[PDB]
Each structure stands twice: as structure tokens, then as C-alpha cells.
Design a protein around this nucleic acid. Structure first.
Lengths: 64, 215, 126, 136, 25, 99
RNA sequence: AGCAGAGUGGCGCAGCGGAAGCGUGCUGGGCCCAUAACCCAGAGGUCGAUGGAUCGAAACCAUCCUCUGCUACCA
RNA sequence: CGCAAGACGGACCAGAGCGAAAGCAUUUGCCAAGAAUGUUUUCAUUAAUCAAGAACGAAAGUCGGAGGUUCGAAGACGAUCAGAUACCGUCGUAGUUCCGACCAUAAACGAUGCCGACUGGCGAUGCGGCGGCGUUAUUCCCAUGACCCGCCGGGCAGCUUCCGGGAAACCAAAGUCUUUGGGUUCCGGGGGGAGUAUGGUUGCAAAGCUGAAACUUAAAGGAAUUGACGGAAGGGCACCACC
RNA sequence: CCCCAUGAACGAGGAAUUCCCAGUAAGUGCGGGUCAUAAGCUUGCGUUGAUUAAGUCCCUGCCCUUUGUACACACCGCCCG
């Protein structure tokens, strides 16, 4: 939306979800706040410690 | 309505509580500016104002909400009057639980003045001192005593003692605590609260008696 | 991956450690050549496995006792724990006294010495 | 837009009246008294699809606008009253209850208190669906 | 449901015979 | 023969009971055959608790809880999977499984 | 005769200012172990005549004829 | 924010209680009734089970009045479907409620007659009585209530096993049965035809009770075991599956 | 089999569907087989050599347990007016 482009980085990978394992739950640290953390769904193959490019942190994951 | 800028045609106000409350600044409201087809005060009186107990006393619990009605307006300050107290949901729910016997009664009662009230109380049985039993149920005979004695106390203290002194006893809840000890012999009991009071009838405005509260 | 050891390895590995405990080192290569001489393993790849498990067992046998096989020095220390423990030589500390309702039994059975009295409160959980 | 003449160290407290459950979410910010009120926004106004009116983001997008017009006026803090449908119905919050709070708080508005209010009978009239109830 | 229907079709049929015999006389 | 001994959940010594309605099948069953699930949750739910609690005007405040008593029926219990099929010798427990 | 419709490109109904429009049928393919249901694919071509605007005319608009529908008479 | 109408007694409410069964949850009072227990009171066999006959008896339905919020057969629509008189959505009459008469039926199921005797163990719960080393509540009290421990009755139930029984499932009764007999009522005879035919009787109506045969057929049915199957549940696996 | 001449459909393909995870897919040639004459086939071999995944039970199917069954010619079963 009218939020500027955010950047947030992985702290840990949780497990794979979706109905073919195509989605991946992941925990991410906000990269400006070190006590803030949100759970996300990320499509691509990820390792740990890599940075994403979030368009919002209003969105939050809860299920497949 | 759909008048142009309909929150720049409104007039702010303040709402003042009785002198018995330590913090008397309740909050703020707004009505539309006067027209000859309907004046400010006529659209401002007869409201209800839910306010917490903690908000006003500033020493104590966040439950025992009071309703207050604006009976008079005085130059951008809206003075209030008692209307009846109520209680939260979660507190009322949490106390109710399995393996207890809930005890309830009400009375219609009159004050020394012309105010008329209709109080609703509650008691719960105690999970006792060192039970190995998993029940706390009581006989039916025992309950009807406790209800009789919960009415007897709550009529004595409210039939005498004028409107303001009633309120003064309910804020620390001296009323409920008195019942808890007086019923203790026939079953110990933990908890007494007055979940509602509903001001049913009330006397004339009486400006002299009015300003006593806001003195 | 995979490669979970079969029972043919685990059967003979235990046997070979019991009867040739002394010959073992903790190196792979030395434990291989010993198994080659004290027995014949008819394959080469099989030999390289049985050595490696014999090595992996011998690591743990130098700690507490394994429950799949026995060696001599453990049965020594077994016997040493099971013939005297340093905790007592006295029975039990020689004098122990008891509270009443035991004293009443002893009264009716001709005993009347070495007692204390405490008459502990009612009752169960109370 | 004209607010009151002081709000510098104090706050002005409105009541938020969040509505819960399915096929609908309201957010309706009012006075302390609730007698008069300000803007009122629905998830059916943000999102048109007739099936995303109860969705999280539709409830968030609603409150993301409503919370602007609050601070525009001078209302800065909010007591919260909840409402699930009740009346011998589901009597349980929808999805868009948790949702709107998380959005409106972080937009910048203060939260003062929160409570549950739901209309719960002490046993009242028969529920629609018949003896055998809905199936399929 | 099945038996309760077999008892019902034969009930209405029995009623019709009564009417038809009452009609005949 | 019987796959029960109670033949309900309890109807011992009592000729009739007042029935009660399922919350999501909209069905009608007895009170003492209905699956009785009481529920405790926080109002705000624990994901956004940090983002809310900081933004309080008070310096402390314990949050309310959400108290609801739910009655499910036989079919709407199995389908939402609060219960499941169990073995022949494993139906004789009365005991709730621990948390 | 007043009013209305049409004068096939498989059928039947004839859709509109972009050369088959709609519904249906036939034939073939797909799905399925198979059938039904369901999903796709077709077909020589001023569409009665005489004219005008037009890039073009069953279809944009006229002048004529014929067949029918409703109404109805000259004969 | 106030008012009106009708309906309804949540959470608390439980393998808890009461009633012959059907059934029975807001307050307070009145009216009559009953079980269990206590008793060194009374009567002295006054009993048990039952053709005839009698009372009560869910819901729906019928007749006459009142009422009609809510839900809602019927009916009218909207979808889904090749079809869809259905499941689903909207509207909605009878009915749902109360008063006075009828109707006598239900998986009215513990699918298990009533009365009596004898035969294992263990822990609970509701009610009465009895005893107590213990704490607590009020006038410090006693009398008493609350909690704790044990004992004796009768009541709703549970757990446990080579009591014994049963085809098994299971059951301290469905046990004490070829070693067959405590008392007594009701009722059953392969599967269909059929709760039909017919006559009797009751009912305003709807129907209830009582109840055959001709003919047809070698299976119908119960419990348990092994497979296969499931638009059942929980795990695991495959580029002849998917992403 | 060779030489000259003739010069069509076809200008990236509907509904559907196959196969494949590392010297692998794809492109490209060669040997053997049948063979008197003759591979667009099959079986092997080299050469050039990617993209995408490091998963899942959604579809299709398979293994194990539990559960239900009027099925055992085994759901492509059985059975009603």
C-alpha cells in the first residue's frame, strides 16, 4: 500500500505447507526491530539468514 | 444528516461527575449547534454514560461500572446523576464454574428519599478448607436460609441511609462483605457482589438537592 | 543414505569383542587386520563393515557396561559392588526407635526397651 | 476539522464498537455516550466480492481508514466494545475481530480498554433450522 | 423409513376400500 | 449386539431430559448425550499481544478472557475432529487426555 | 386489401448498422474398464428482385413482387 | 434512549435427585401427598401374583373459545441438477401457546415381568442414624453448621475375576438347570401371504382393539472370525502420481 | 540406388495427454540385429550438454494400523418400488 518497501530477514525455518508442499512457513525478524517477529509464507527455496522484500507486514500467516 | 462539514458544525462539551469521585473529569461529548427547531440541551439530556470504577476512584478494580445520566446542563459542563451500577461479563463468568452451587436473590427497595432501587446480588459456595471431596454442593434447605439472610441485610442498609450513603457503601463493597461473614456459620461462602442495580423510579429534579452532589 | 547395519554384523561383532577383547585398539585399520586373522570374513566389503562396528562398540565399552555383551573386568567390578558397599557395616545404625501402637505390640510380646514416644496428629492428608 | 481546545497531555476517548461475525464486519466509532457518532465503514465497501466481507484484510483495510478520521477530528484513544451476533446463534467472534485491532493500533491510535459484550439470552425463543438442522 | 411407508400406503388403500364400499351402499 | 453399556452418555434413573441444540449442525439432541466443550481463550489472541500491550494508555492491565460453553452433537463433533474412532478395548476409558 | 414477418450456409426458430445469430440435431474426437452426464471440433454458399449512402448489406435505408401470420374485401 | 407484545427459564446442571409410568429446573407463599431412616409404641397373619373391571398415559391429530412473538407441515419463489415435486436460501398458512372436551398410540427400550431366599472382592456418590482422636465458623462457649475419619440401613451407578452361566457378544445376574420342581401372571412355534381379509366393538373425524385362510418357498435370522471395499480415521511411500 | 524436371500441405498447433532429476533431459552421428537386394523399426555406443526440484499426499496409486459393512463371482458388489 502506502507503506514504503520493507526488508526483513529469516531467523529460522519452520516447515513446509500448502497442498503440495509448495509454501514454506518461516519466522522472520524485522531487521529494524530485533524483538519484533512475524510468521510468513514464502514460495521459493530458502535456507536461513537471507533477506526478503516485504511490501507489507500487515499481512500475517496462520495456515496453508 | 448530510450538512456540509458535519463535524465542524458540532460543539464540544465536558462532562462533570459528583464530588464523591476523586477524579471528576469523565470526558467529552458533542451535540449540534442550536437551531429553533431543536435546541442543544434537548438533544444532550437523557443520555447514559458508562464509566468504570477504576477510572474515577484511581485506587482500585476495573469492574463495577456505573451508569450516569445527564439531568442538567450548565454552560458547557454537563452534570451527572446516579442511574444504577452494573458489572463486567468476564468476572461474572469466571466465578461461575462446575461443582459449586450458585445462590441468587433480589429485592425491591425504597430509599429515605424518593429514589427506588432494585438490587441484584449473588453468592457462591466455598471450595472448602481441606476437602478431599470433589463437590461443594449444599442442601436446598440451607440455600433458602442464605437467600433470606441476603435480603435482610440488603434492605436494612438501603431502606435507611440516603442515596449518597448507599453509593459510599458499594464502592469498597462493605455491603457484600457484611453478608459473607453473616452467612459464614451455615456455610462458609466465598464471594458476594451486586451484579446490577436498576434505578426504577426517581423523584423530581430538586435543584437544591442536585447541587449538593456537585458541591 | 540409509545403510543401517543388519543383524549378521551385530551378531558377530559382539562375539568377536568378547573373545578377543585384548587384541582391540580403537583405530579402524588395526581392528580390521585383527578380524582378518582371528576369523575369516568371506567378503572384503563385509570385513570393512564388521571392523567399523567393532570400533564403534569399543568406544562405549570404555565407559559404563554394555547390555548386549559381557567382558571380564566389568564382571569384576560387578562382584566388587555386590559383596560389600561402603555405606554400612552396621545394622542399620544399631539403634532405631519407634512411635506408639508399635510399642503396644511389643508390650504384649515381652519387649520393653529402646523406644520413643510421639503421638502424631490426625489424619490422612489432614 | 475542529477538535477540542486541549488534548495535549490528556486523550479523548471514543468507543469503537467492533462487530464480529460472518459475511460482514462493521467498525463504528462513536462518543463515550454512544448517542452521536462519526464515520462507519464495512468490509463490503472496501472489498466487493460478496464473500470476502468477513476476511482479515478487509477488516484491517476498513480500520486503516477509520483510524485516520479519528485522529483528524481529535479522538486519539479508544475504549473497545465487542459484539458477536448472539441471540441463540453462533455467539462466537468471526475472523475480523483479531484483525482490525492489530491494524488500527499500529496505525498510531491508542488503546485504552477492551471487553466482551455479546447479547446472550437466559434462554429464549427457538432457533431457525428445524429439528434435524442444516445438512449439506 | 421403509417399513413405515409400507404401513402407510396400505393405510390409505384400506381407507379407500371403506369409502368405496360405503359408496356402493 | 450393543456397542455401549450406557447407550448414551448417561440416562440412569431418569425418564426424560430437556434437549439442547447443536451450534453448527443446528440439530437437536439430549443435553446428556451432547459433547460438552468449554473454551478459554484471550480476547486479543496471542500473536498481536505485544503490538497491543505497548500501545495501552495504562502501564499495566491484565486482559479479559473469552468464556463460551459449546454443545456439539454426534456428527458435528466427528467432522470438526474433536473426537475420533477408537479401538474395542480402548473405548472403556472415561478419562480426558492431558494437555 | 390494413398491419406484421420472411424469402437459409445442416435442421427449426429467423439476430443485429462487421459476411450464418440463437436453440437444436447429426457426424467425429475427449473423459471413463465401459455407458450415461460433462467438455471440445465441424459445413462449396449477394440469404426473392430493382436502387441509393456506404469500406460493405438477410442484416444501413428505400422502391417492387411473392408466400404466410392477425385483421378482413374488392373479386 | 424509552415503550409494547408474545414466547422462554441459559451458564450454574452432574453415569446427581424425585415420580407408578408418561415426566419434572427463575422468586416467594399457600394447599394436599410420599420415600428412606430412627423407635424396648400399636394391631396380630391382616399376604404374594392376578381373568373381569378401573385411573394416569409423550408428540401428532379432531371439536369449541382465547391468543398468535418465534419456529413452521402446506403453498409461492430463488438456486443446484441432464432431470430435482428434494438436500440449501427468502417468504409463509395450518400448527406451535392457553382454557374446556375428545383421541390411547411410540425404538412408550435396560429391546431384560412382579414377590422371596442363597452365593466374591474394592473404591465412590445422594439421604437418614450412630461414634470420634482432629480443625474451623458464632456469645469464649455448650446445643449446631462447614471440612476430616470410621460404622449401620436402604437408593442411582462403576471398577475388578477360572463365582457360575451363555452360541457368543456379555451378565454378581441373563448365576444357584439333564445333579432339571420356591410362588404366580403374560407370551412364543421355519420365512412370506398380513396386522391384510371378515364379523364384533369403541370413536364426531383420523383410527384403535380383537384377527384368519387359500396359495407360495428352502431358506429367512443371530453372534463371532478371516478377506475385500469405504465420497471413514491415523501413520508412511512413488516423476509409470502431483507440485 | 542415382540424374534432370514438377514444387503440395505446413507460417507452431483445440478438447486432452506422455516422459524425464546428472554426463541426466534435449540435439547429433555410428555399430549390431533382420538381410540375395533394403530401415523412418528395435538394441547398444560415443560426441555436444541445459532449465528446474532437494518437496508433498492435492490428484492417480501403493504399504501398515484402527473402524464400519445386508459385500465373499468380493463395490465393475448387493438391493427397492
Amino acid at each position: 500500500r502506502v507503506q514504503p518497501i520493507k526488508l526483513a530477514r529469516v531467523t529460522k525455518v519452520l516447515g513446509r505447507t500448502g497442498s503440495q508442499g509448495q509454501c514454506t512457513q518461516v519466522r522472520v525478524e524485522f531487521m529494524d526491530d530485533t524483538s519484533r517477529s512475524i510468521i510468513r509464507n514464502v514460495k521459493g527455496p530458502v535456507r536461513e539468514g537471507d533477506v526478503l522484500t516485504l511490501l507489507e507486514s500487515e499481512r500475517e500467516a496462520r495456515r496453508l | 444528516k448530510k450538512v456540509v462539514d458535519p463535524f465542524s458544525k458540532k460543539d464540544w462539551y465536558d462532562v462533570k461527575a459528583p464530588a464523591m469521585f476523586n477524579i471528576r473529569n469523565i470526558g467529552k461529548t458533542l451535540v449540534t449547534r442550536t437551531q429553533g427547531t431543536k435546541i442543544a440541551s434537548d438533544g444532550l439530556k437523557g443520555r447514559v454514560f458508562e464509566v468504570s470504577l477504576a477510572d474515577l476512584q484511581n485506587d482500585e478494580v476495573a469492574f463495577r461500572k456505573f451508569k450516569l445520566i445527564t439531568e442538567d446542563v450548565q454552560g458547557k459542563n454537563c452534570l451527572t446523576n446516579f442511574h444504577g451500577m452494573d458489572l463486567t461479563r468476564d468476572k461474572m463468568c469466571s466465578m461461575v464454574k462446575k461443582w459449586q452451587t450458585m445462590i441468587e436473590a433480589h429485592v425491591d427497595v425504597k430509599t429515605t428519599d424518593g429514589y427506588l432501587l432494585h438490587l441484584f446480588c449473588v453468592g457462591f459456595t466455598k471450595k472448602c478448607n481441606n476437602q478431599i471431596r470433589k463437590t461443594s454442593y449444599a442442601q436446598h434447605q440451607q440455600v433458602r436460609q442464605i437467600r433470606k439472610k441476603m435480603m435482610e441485610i440488603m434492605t436494612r442498609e438501603v431502606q435507611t441511609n440516603d442515596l449518597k450513603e448507599v453509593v459510599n457503601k458499594l464502592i469498597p463493597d462493605s455491603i457484600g462483605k457484611d453478608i459473607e461473614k453473616a452467612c459464614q456459620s451455615i456455610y462458609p461462602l466465598h464471594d458476594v457482589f451486586v451484579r446490577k442495580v436498576k434505578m426504577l423510579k426517581k423523584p423530581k429534579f430538586e435543584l437544591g438537592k442536585l447541587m449538593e452532589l456537585h458541591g | 543414505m540409509g545403510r543401517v547395519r543388519t543383524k549378521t554384523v551385530k551378531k558377530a561383532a559382539r562375539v568377536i569383542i568378547e573373545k578377543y577383547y585384548t587384541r582391540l585398539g580403537n583405530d579402524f585399520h588395526t581392528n580390521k587386520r585383527v578380524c582378518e586373522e582371528i576369523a575369516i570374513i568371506p567378503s572384503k566389503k563385509l570385513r570393512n563393515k564388521i571392523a567399523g562396528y567393532v570400533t564403534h562398540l569399543m568406544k562405549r565399552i570404555q565407559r559404563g557396561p554394555v547390555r548386549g555383551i559381557s567382558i571380564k573386568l566389568q564382571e569384576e567390578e560387578r562382584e566388587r559392588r555386590d559383596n560389600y558397599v561402603p555405606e554400612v557395616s552396621a545394622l542399620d545404625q544399631e539403634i532405631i526407635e519407634v512411635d506408639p501402637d508399635t510399642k503396644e505390640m511389643l508390650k504384649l510380646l515381652d519387649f520393653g526397651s529402646l523406644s520413643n514416644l510421639q503421638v502424631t496428629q490426625p489424619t490422612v492428608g489432614m | 476539522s475542529l477538535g477540542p481546545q486541549v488534548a495535549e497531555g490528556e486523550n479523548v476517548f471514543g468507543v469503537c464498537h467492533i462487530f464480529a461475525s460472518f459475511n460482514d464486519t462493521f467498525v463504528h466509532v462513536t462518543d463515550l455516550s454512544g448517542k452521536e457518532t462519526i464515520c462507519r465503514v464495512t468490509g463490503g465497501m472496501k472489498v466487493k466480492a460478496d464473500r470476502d466481507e468477513s476476511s482479515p484484510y478487509a477488516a484491517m483495510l476498513a480500520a486503516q481508514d477509520v483510524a485516520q478520521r479519528c485522529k483528524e477530528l481529535g479522538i486519539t484513544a479508544l475504549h473497545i466494545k465487542l459484539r458477536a451476533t448472539g441471540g441463540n446463534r453462533t455467539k462466537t467472534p468471526g475472523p475480523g475481530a483479531q484483525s482490525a485491532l492489530r491494524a488500527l493500533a499500529r496505525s498510531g491510535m491508542k488503546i485504552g480498554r477492551i471487553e466482551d459484550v455479546t447479547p446472550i439470552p437466559s434462554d429464549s425463543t427457538r432457533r431457525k433450522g428445524g429439528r434435524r438442522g442444516r445438512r449439506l | 423409513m421403509r417399513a413405515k411407508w409400507r404401513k402407510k400406503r396400505m393405510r390409505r388403500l384400506k381407507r379407500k376400500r371403506r369409502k368405496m364400499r360405503q359408496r356402493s351402499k | 449386539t450393543k456397542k455401549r453399556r450406557n447407550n448414551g452418555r448417561a440416562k440412569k434413573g431418569r425418564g426424560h431430559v430437556q434437549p439442547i441444540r447443536c451450534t453448527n449442525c443446528a440439530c437437536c439432541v439430549p443435553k446428556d448425550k451432547a459433547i460438552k466443550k468449554f473454551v478459554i481463550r484471550n480476547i486479543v489472541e496471542a500473536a498481536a499481544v505485544r503490538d497491543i500491550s505497548e500501545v495501552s494508555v495504562f502501564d499495566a492491565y491484565v486482559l479479559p478472557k473469552l468464556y463460551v460453553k459449546l454443545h456439539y452433537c454426534v456428527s458435528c463433533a466427528i467432522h470438526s475432529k474433536v473426537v475420533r474412532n477408537r479401538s474395542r478395548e480402548a473405548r472403556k476409558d472415561r478419562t480426558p487426555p492431558p494437555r
